[PDB]
Design a binder for this molecule. Structure first.
Ligand code: NAG
Lengths: 40, 49, 49, 191
């Protein structure tokens, strides 16, 4: 019925090319290790 | 964490646990041995009067 | 950093505004950038000693 | 100068000559996209009693790229035309139609309206007892009318790529973009 959401649901915040950097993003994300409902 | 090809290969959630907030303050994924100031805390007011 | 101005890039203040109210936005960036050069130079003089 | 291959005009005569206007409690909204029209046609000193711009200057509207234009349509009484500025308080600016505190666009001016309202509206939010606002946000996609030129590499030039100005040397790149990415930046956040 419920399950775990390890490290999933990360997207690209914008359309600016970046390479070999460590950018900090503030946006709406799916938090790690949250509980997701299972439907069937 | 981007790479040579400009693709995201890793991330860190900066409010999961204390080690993640340490990693976000130092802006790295490996942390050397030490003690690090990361945040503050403060109790919020319960109601108005 | 934009230091209170509409943009931190100077070319697109100069391409968007007219010389009366472009100087109002350029003075904010000038004071913000002088203060940071001044802070850099002072701590370099303290480390050199 | 590099502006994209695009030819058609924007329907500015549509919103300025349709004799059916709208009201202030329920105002008329239109998106403008993918068209190369002039703004100096409005600089022609027509029947414009108010012509007032906020984030830009009207002389420089010809050579920018805006990504969108929203057009608004309502009718005011006439004496309250100072309530369609940012940071104003009144029966329109609090109960019928409110601009944000950070507005970028032009205001042009030349019949039920709401009287009672339980809370002041949010910016751009939609008992009743009985003007065009252009807004935009700084992909080019609107791109005012300016003739493009040819591309020159390997030497110090000025450039203008959809309103992004600068000066530098242009060479060919080996950084493989992904087919949604347009700009490119570095550690210090520069193009
Ligand atoms: C980047 O992509 C290319 C494919 O064109 C591949 O050959 C290369 O190994 C990739 N780089 C890394 C670090 O995986």
């Amino acid at each position: 019925a419920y399950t775990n959401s390890f490290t999933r649901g990360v997207y690209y915040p914008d359309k600016v090319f970046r390479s070999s950097v460590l950018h900090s993003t503030q946006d709406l994300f799916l938090p790690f290790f949250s509980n997701v409902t299972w439907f069937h | 964490k981007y790479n040579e090809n400009g693709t995201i290969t890793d991330a860190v959630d900066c409010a999961l646990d204390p080690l993640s907030e340490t990693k976000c303050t130092l802006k790295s994924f490996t942390v050397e041995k030490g003690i690090y100031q990361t945040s503050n805390f403060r109790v919020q007011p319960t109601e108005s009067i | 950093s934009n230091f209170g101005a509409i943009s931190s890039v100077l070319n697109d203040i100069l391409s968007r505004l007219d010389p009366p109210e472009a100087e109002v936005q350029i003075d904010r960036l000038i004071t913000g950038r002088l203060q940071s050069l001044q802070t850099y130079v002072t701590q370099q003089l303290i480390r050199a000693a | 100068v590099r502006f994209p291959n695009i030819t058609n005009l924007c329907p500015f005569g549509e919103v300025f000559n349709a004799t059916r206007f709208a009201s202030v409690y329920a105002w008329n909204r239109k998106r403008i996209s993918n068209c190369v029209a002039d703004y100096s046609v409005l600089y022609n000193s027509a029947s414009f009693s108010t012509f007032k711009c906020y984030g830009v200057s009207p002389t420089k509207l010809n050579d920018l790229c805006f990504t969108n234009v929203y057009a608004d349509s309502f009718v005011i009484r006439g004496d309250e035309v100072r309530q369609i500025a940012p940071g104003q308080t009144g029966k329109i600016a609090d109960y019928n139609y409110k601009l944000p505190d950070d507005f970028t666009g032009c205001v042009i001016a030349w019949y039920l309206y709401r009287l009672f309202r339980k809370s002041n509206l949010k910016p751009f939010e939609r008992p009743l007892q009985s003007v065009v606002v252009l807004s935009f946000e700084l992909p080019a996609t609107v791109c005012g009318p300016k003739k493009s030129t040819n591309l020159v590499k390997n030497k110090c030039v000025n450039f203008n790529f959809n309103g992004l100005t600068g000066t530098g040397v242009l060479t060919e790149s080996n950084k493989k973009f992904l087919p949604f990415q347009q700009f490119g930046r570095d550690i210090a956040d520069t193009t």
